[PDB]
Design a protein around this nucleic acid. Sequence first.
RNA 1: GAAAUUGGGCGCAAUAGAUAUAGUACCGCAAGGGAAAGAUGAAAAAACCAAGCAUAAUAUAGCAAGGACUAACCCCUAUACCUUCUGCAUAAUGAAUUAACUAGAAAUAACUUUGCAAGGAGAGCCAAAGCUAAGACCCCCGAAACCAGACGA
Lengths: 100, 166, 97, 103, 275, 101, 140
Amino acid sequence: RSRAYTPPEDLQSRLESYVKEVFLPSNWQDISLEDSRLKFNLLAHLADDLGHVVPNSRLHQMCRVRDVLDFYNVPIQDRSKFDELSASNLPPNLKITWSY
Amino acid sequence: ISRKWEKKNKIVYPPQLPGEPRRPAEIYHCRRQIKYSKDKMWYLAKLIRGMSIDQALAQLEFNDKKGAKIIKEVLLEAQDMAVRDHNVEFRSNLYIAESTSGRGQCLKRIRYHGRGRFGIMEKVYCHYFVKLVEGPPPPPEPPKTAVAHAKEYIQQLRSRTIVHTL
Amino acid sequence: IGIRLTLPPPKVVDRWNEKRAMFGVYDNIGILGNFEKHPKELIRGPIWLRGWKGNELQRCIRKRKMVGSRMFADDLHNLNKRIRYLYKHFNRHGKFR
Amino acid sequence: TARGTPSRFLASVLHNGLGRYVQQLQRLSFSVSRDGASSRGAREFVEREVIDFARRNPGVVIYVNSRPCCVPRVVAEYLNGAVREESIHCKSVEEISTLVQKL
Amino acid sequence: VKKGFRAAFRFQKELERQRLLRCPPPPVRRSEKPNWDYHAEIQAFGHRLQENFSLDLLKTAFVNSCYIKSEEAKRQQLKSNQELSEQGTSFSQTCLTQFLEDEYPDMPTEGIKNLVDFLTGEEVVCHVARNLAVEQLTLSEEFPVPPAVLQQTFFAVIGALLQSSGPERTALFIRDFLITQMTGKELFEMWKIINPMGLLVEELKKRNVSAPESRLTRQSGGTTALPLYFVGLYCDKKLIAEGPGETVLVAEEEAARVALRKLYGFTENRRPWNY
Amino acid sequence: RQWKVTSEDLILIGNELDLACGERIRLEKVLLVGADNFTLLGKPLLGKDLVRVEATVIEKTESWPRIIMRFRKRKNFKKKRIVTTPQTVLRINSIEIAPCL
Amino acid sequence: LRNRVTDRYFRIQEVLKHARHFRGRKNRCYRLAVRTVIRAFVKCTKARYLKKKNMRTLWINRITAASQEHGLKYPALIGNLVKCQVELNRKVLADLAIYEPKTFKSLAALASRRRHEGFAAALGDGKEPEGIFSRVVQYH
RNA sequence: GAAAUUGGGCGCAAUAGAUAUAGUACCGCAAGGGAAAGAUGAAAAAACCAAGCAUAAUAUAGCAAGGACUAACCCCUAUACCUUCUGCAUAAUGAAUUAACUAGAAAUAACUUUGCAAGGAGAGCCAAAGCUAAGACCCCCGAAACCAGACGA
Ligand SMILES: [Mg+2]
Ligand SMILES: [Mg+2]
Ligand SMILES: [Mg+2]
Ligand SMILES: [Mg+2]
Ligand SMILES: [Mg+2]
Ligand SMILES: [Mg+2]
Ligand SMILES: [Mg+2]
Ligand SMILES: [Mg+2]
Ligand SMILES: [Mg+2]
Ligand SMILES: [Mg+2]
């Protein structure tokens, strides 16, 4: 298990291939997700393939397929703060150790 | 209670280098709970505080006080210890460096006074600590001569600065 | 010299004890248990203050009235003296009137 | 008071202003707890402004130790061997950034 | 027993300060202590002095000779220092005389060589080296670092700076750290002279001037224990110096020192050094 | 105030000067310049054309912790306050003079 | 005793560290120390008004000492260095007299020239041209 | 001041907590009063910190310090604290000093902050924006006495 997720370069067409599998019409990014089953079949296919599930806090923010697109092209990266600081281009007189 | 003076005879210094002068012996010895007061012992302890051990045993054989008969028992056991245990070759080559007296754990009795009133009488005890250092006694400090007072006055004139300015 | 020389043995507190992990359960037994029990029926202590809060005079009045018939003989006299004292303190002494 | 406390004359270390100005800090040493509310501002100082600080003067070599402490300290060591160990315990990020620039 | 922990902890740390005020520990060198990175302290050593070294050639300027012997002794259970330290000692001798022969032309080569021996002596260099963190960075055997080795390490730093940035930047490194050690210091606090009265007859004979007639200009309280005389040194009935003293022999021995300073250009009110 | 100032000396001022440590500063308002053989003294200042007094900044310390205690007898009036006034140290580098007379 | 004080040792040492250099039992006994440590702190702040008073009285006594060496009184020197717009204060004038007595001899020469220019303007009443050192510099 | 009526520890841990190691020792003819205190280690069949002193007596001058100072003192400045008072350096009170103990307990109404709102509240009660809940204000020692019951010639 690993929380890190990089947005794929073709997630625009990868999401469009999943909309055509759950339904198709013109302006496919403005399809309202007011159906409970239709939001389930779309977001289960994205979370199983891409490996990134929508959290319960953000599951209600998705009224359109536009909002599903905006969630999958933000990069999350959960690494330790040791790896975040010591790989943030330290000047040569910063020394960071971790007693953990 | 504390008994730190008894443990000072167990400090073991590292073995000396030949490019170093010979360390003199130190012999810490004490007697506790002497039925005598701690400030009547100070006059006997101040008397012998720089003397050599043979002059100390001379000036205590002829003192009339009670504690002089007790210090002379302490100084004789500490002189016998220095040739036995702490490796001093000459009995006469010792002098008293430190000679003090602390107070001991004192008992309390009731002294009756002239009416229903009374007082609390305290049966005094005391300690007596000595240290003998192996060697001849150092000479007593002479009074500083008129040359030495004049040097200190001229050195106090020479040291003064123009104060509260650059 | 009132300060200790050695630091005390370490206080190990289990925060996942039985009494700590299940603390607070059934405090809302009324409002989501169809109001069959009040939460004041969940508190265990003396008989005269199972669900009741008062000052020191109102506690001794209530202790003498509820459980005072079966109190010990010089515990009842220590209580009667306390109500006789707290009456005179609360009703006659004090700053504000 | 002044008769209790020692005193000294106004001096510099090695005539610090005559030829060139030598920065007199050698080291800063931060102990900063990873989990602990007392070093909340000290964690935000390391995250934000210790990298902007370690470039503003490259003579100071800064050590962030990051060990489980209750009180976060800053141990400023100077060029004449003096050590001034101060605490940044429960200080905001703007209060450590002036405390370090004072050092 | 008063219950609690926070006051028993503080007293445990006020006992440990008193255990170091009653028994202070021996000094340990900086590299055997927490928070030390030897590569990072050398790059910080350069930028501190506003100058740049070749960092590998500065690393060899700190490793001494006695360290390599006692690194091979513990190996039973690296270049030396002498090459860079010989270049730095030999250059900073010819660099300091060029600084002092330009500012004080009237001083003889005896007095200039006695000034460079002060500015490169163990009293000045090992005071300068301890406040530029040279003792912290040097690799020696015994600690505290002896002043015969710490002087060798300091001139290796000047020797390493010569190869890094030439003799122009290095002369400014000698001007800022060695010549600042003569500020406020008298000439004869640096060049100690036996018999300054006889050394003035030699120098006044060099300029073809008459030998001075020592004359008592002012005096006060000659029959006391605190006298004050003012022996003036007149030549051709024009004085070259006057000097005070406790007796006539001190005030005459000191009036030669005032005239020696007025001849070599080392007065107290001379033009200060330019930086 | 007025500082009698020579070259290579130190001055301690009791306020922050909003400067960086090391910045060379030209002290204006010179009001007496003297040598061994002459002195020039303004009315009340010398011109900026004539003198140029330089100064670096060495250290920007605080003062020693300096107590303010108030007390009045028989009145329960007792206050204590500890202030550390900020200080700066200037090193005068050169007193140049120019022939503008 | 539910919560009694566990840290009373360190409150005593807040006071007793200031009393270590006293005499008698004021350096040891806390009850006697606070009545002197408080009193040693009030004198420490009431003597910030006496340091500035005793320094200026010292500067006046070091200017009066040195102006008498040139035959000037103290009000004849300060009063006529103001009239030449020479705004030197007492600290520098007492530190000119010690460390630069040639410059102080020039300020005693200047304050006596302006004094004689003040008398010669006062004996010659009516319109006379001003003295040379008596001409003020105006700022606008 | 009614009634009808209604229905184990956010404890103490050897001056604490019991007076309690004990109602013993001791005190009183008697009724009665009534204490104090102990600390090793797995096994004894194995330091540093109060007052007080000492180490180490003292040097002209003065609330014991402060400003200082090259320098301890010398110089300059300064009439302990608490309480009580018109007003105290007061020759008014209290205090040798150290350690520990020793003194602000609560109502309606208002205010602040929420909840819900012509209604609030887990029956009772209040309500012409109210109502419910919380928070926040009320000390210590001391008489001569008075009475009841015992115990004492
Ligand atoms: Mg007695
Ligand atoms: Mg009823
Ligand atoms: Mg008890
Ligand atoms: Mg003591
Ligand atoms: Mg006096
Ligand atoms: Mg009065
Ligand atoms: Mg009185
Ligand atoms: Mg009274
Ligand atoms: Mg009395
Ligand atoms: Mg009878």
